[PDB]
Symmetry: D2
Subunit: 116 residues, 4 copies
């Protein structure tokens, strides 16, 4: 599991469940090619987006559908979504956890990058 | 001043100075029309991006060049940039402060929305 | 104004108004001498806590009554309060802005430290 | 495992390893009785602080020694420590993860509270 995304709800103090996201990889021609997608589980985590052999160096973009999460709780949040864009594996293969901590008018995103 | 962006450096505990950013507005055809740009001042703030007459309802995107900020300081950061995408003035005219708090591997963004 | 505290509400996207806080300074005998107190204004800011002459080196503690803020709004929060403890003026006189960004189950605190 | 504390380093994008912390519980007489202690492991997590039978309702305080973590990397950080104070189990037994995300001049703390 070289890429995992974890989403937390800072209002309820709970995993953010059923949050959709779409991952892209920058192509050689500067275009965003679709790379992976899924939704967070009951623990707020999305595992299995990619594999070690597929997850080569590149610039990746994770678009997290935070607006639908809040709308489903009845709230019009501030942000349309939360995007995380990063270069991956520039110094060799790494395992990435992207964490997103969500409030209606604020979010934080952090990367925990480890070497297996 | 209906739109102000403020950028802080969580490593040094200081305003993030000379941070470039570009602002877009979603057009009727789903495309990002360029809207405004600037660099943060010595206080970490970028004022004067737009006016009340021009800052109509819409979806706006602020792309903050955090990567160049960190590179200039002797640190190679995780994120390529920090993007904030939001609907503005839906209810209607408001003043927005977008704050971004930057660390090399983490950032948070918050909106402070007031009614004059 | 060598010490200012600013409190923001990440749920509503607004200054956190009428938030009480108490400031202490560690005495020579390791005890917390009461130092200053106040409530945030309509802008979420509390100014005038101390003066340059009084704000000497030391360890200071800011206790922010976040629980009463949330309770007053119809939310029972996780934290009893938000405490910020820091050494001040070690190198030497600085101006400090302490920012606290509040959610019911999460808060962040950052210091913006400048040299006049 | 009804109480777990996880500490992350937002500068390096890594678990914060070997971070010491001390946990207290408010006694009937308003005094802080020592409750548990330990240090984070290689994953930045501290497990096994308490048990279900011991972890009764009460107000608990977690003092995280963030200053030593930064000093050991050569840095004089802003905060003396990071304290988290909360009422636990007021509505029945819950499992608590306290996460702390650390930068030299900023930290955030979030609670993820679940019902087994
Ligand atoms: N694989 C894959 C995949 C990538 C993106 Br980006 C998507 O939006 C969806 Br739907 C699937
Ligand atoms: N922010 C944040 C954050 C919170 C939790 Br709890 C995690 O397990 C990780 Br990884 C990151
Ligand atoms: N007005 C304006 C303006 C908008 C965008 Br976006 C830019 O990247 C630059 Br340069 C200027
Ligand atoms: N000056 C002062 C002052 C300090 C603290 Br410690 C207080 O709780 C209050 Br009331 C006032
Ligand atoms: N975090 C944070 C934060 C700090 C400052 Br000094 C601000 O003015 C705003 Br607005 C947000
Ligand atoms: N059990 C226990 C225990 C609690 C706290 Br307070 C401590 O600081 C240490 Br040392 C141990």
């Amino acid at each position: 599991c070289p890429l995992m995304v974890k989403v937390l709800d800072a209002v309820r103090g709970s995993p953010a469940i059923n949050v959709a996201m779409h991952v892209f990889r920058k192509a050689a021609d500067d275009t965003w090619e679709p790379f992976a997608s899924g939704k967070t589980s009951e623990s707020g985590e999305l595992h299995g987006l990619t594999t070690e052999e597929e997850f080569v160096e590149g610039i990746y973009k994770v678009e997290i559908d935070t607006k639908s999460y809040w709308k489903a709780l009845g709230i019009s949040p501030f942000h349309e979504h939360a995007e995380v864009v990063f270069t991956a594996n520039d110094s060799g293969p790494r395992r990435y956890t992207i964490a997103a901590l969500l409030s209606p008018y604020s979010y934080s995103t952090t990367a925990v990058v480890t070497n297996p």
